[PDB]
Design an enzyme around this catalytic site. Structure first.
Site, PDB file in Angstrom:
ATOM      1  N   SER A  54      -3.748  -8.240  -1.260  1.00 53.54           N
ATOM      2  CA  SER A  54      -4.755  -7.414  -0.806  1.00 53.54           C
ATOM      3  C   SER A  54      -5.438  -5.798  -1.362  1.00 53.54           C
ATOM      4  CB  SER A  54      -3.559  -6.050   0.344  1.00 53.54           C
ATOM      5  OG  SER A  54      -4.718  -5.022   1.388  1.00 53.54           O
ATOM      6  N   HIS A  99       0.732  -1.206   0.049  1.00 55.36           N
ATOM      7  CA  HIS A  99       0.282  -0.151  -0.403  1.00 55.36           C
ATOM      8  C   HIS A  99       0.579   1.224  -0.133  1.00 55.36           C
ATOM      9  CE1 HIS A  99      -3.703  -2.475   0.248  1.00 55.36           C
ATOM     10  NE2 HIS A  99      -3.430  -2.624   1.587  1.00 55.36           N
ATOM     11  N   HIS A 136      -6.575  -0.933  -5.657  1.00 53.36           N
ATOM     12  CA  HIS A 136      -4.745  -0.752  -6.171  1.00 53.36           C
ATOM     13  C   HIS A 136      -5.395  -2.366  -5.324  1.00 53.36           C
ATOM     14  CE1 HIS A 136      -3.848   1.274  -2.832  1.00 53.36           C
ATOM     15  NE2 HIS A 136      -3.684   0.150  -2.080  1.00 53.36           N
TER      16      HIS A 136
END
Ligand SMILES: [K+]
Lengths: 207, 192
Positions: free
Chosen positions: A100, A32, A111
């Site tokens: 994830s 992330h 995303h």
């Protein structure tokens, strides 16, 4: 074995089972972190056992990085088991074995991230050069489901995907890598995830 | 709270050597200030002086979970804490002494700190007399005069090692037992 593909669940069964599927390319990032785009998703689908994702790793800068990593990593000299040696795939399974999906809770999804360990169980990834082989690794994904997923994968020419934004400082990634070794029971959790995902051997998974 | 010292056993029985990382070439981060024969083994003391390495460690601590981890018993020391997360072990090659993801021999867990006396005092297996000898030796060395460490290894090489460390089986458990074997007294910045 030219293209690099990735596939796996981002969630194994509020809810997002209503904004799926997403056939439009979403960025694939790392932990992330911003500026860590390595490629694009080729489809996010709802299936019997959860939300399955497929994508392609196209970032040249990242592929170079991953490649340099595998060259010195222990995976370079690790003995052959059931599959031929694929340093790239193997380093990816050592470094970023998890998936994830990122979303807002209530452009609905921003995303999909490759990570050290998925927060959700059974979110372990499968990396490969063959999309069909990759998806077929999931025995929890029916034949019809697979055929459907692959139809979307092949309907896209990776050669037309925009260049991923991968400029993030290497230190930032290294810090995440360092922090990962201290995630408790990561290796155990990783082993369970493999089972939860019903992944079939042989695979380059490292646990 | 300027200089960086490291201490720990390189072997638990019961001329400055370069300090490197994972036995890799061009990863000298400092020098050993002495290897001592003590009752429980071979105790090592060193000073981390590489400006490049310290900047890197510092850069890593900034984005690491350690910079956000809540205070436990000690005050936040990102640099010390990232070293304990990244390279908590020691290993003697005497050619050099390497900071590693995990020591080759058991009980080789390191203690990083800014106070040499505090560092050595963490080891209750090191007697008061032994500690006095080690400290007298340590402080008899002006650090602002050791030769610059050759730290030029590509970052990639170090990162590969960090990724591999994550897959060392029973690493966190072995680090916990290593702490007991070395008889380290709390509180310390060790992460296991
Ligand atoms: K479709």
């Amino acid at each position: 074995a030219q293209g690099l593909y990735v596939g796996g669940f981002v969630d194994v069964v509020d809810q997002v089972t209503d904004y799926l599927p997403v056939t439009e390319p979403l960025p694939i990032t790392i932990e992330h972190l911003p500026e860590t785009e390595v490629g694009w998703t080729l489809g996010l689908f709802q299936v019997s056992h959860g939300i399955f994702c497929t994508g392609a790793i196209t970032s040249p800068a990242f592929l170079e990085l991953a490649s340099r990593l595998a060259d010195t990593s222990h995976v370079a000299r690790a003995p052959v088991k059931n599959l031929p040696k694929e340093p790239l795939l193997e380093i990816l399974h050592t470094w970023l074995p998890g998936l994830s999906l990122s979303s807002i809770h209530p452009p609905v999804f921003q995303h999909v991230s490759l990570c050290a360990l998925g927060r959700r169980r059974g979110t372990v990834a499968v990396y490969g050069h063959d999309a069909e082989w990759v998806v077929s690794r999931f025995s929890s994904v029916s034949k019809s489901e697979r055929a459907h997923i692959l139809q979307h994968v092949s309907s896209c020419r990776l050669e037309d995907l925009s260049t991923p934004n991968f400029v993030s400082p290497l230190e930032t990634l290294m810090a995440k890598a360092i922090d990962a070794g201290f995630i408790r029971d990561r290796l155990d959790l990783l082993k369970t995830d493999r089972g939860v995902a019903s992944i079939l051997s042989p695979v380059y998974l490292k646990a």
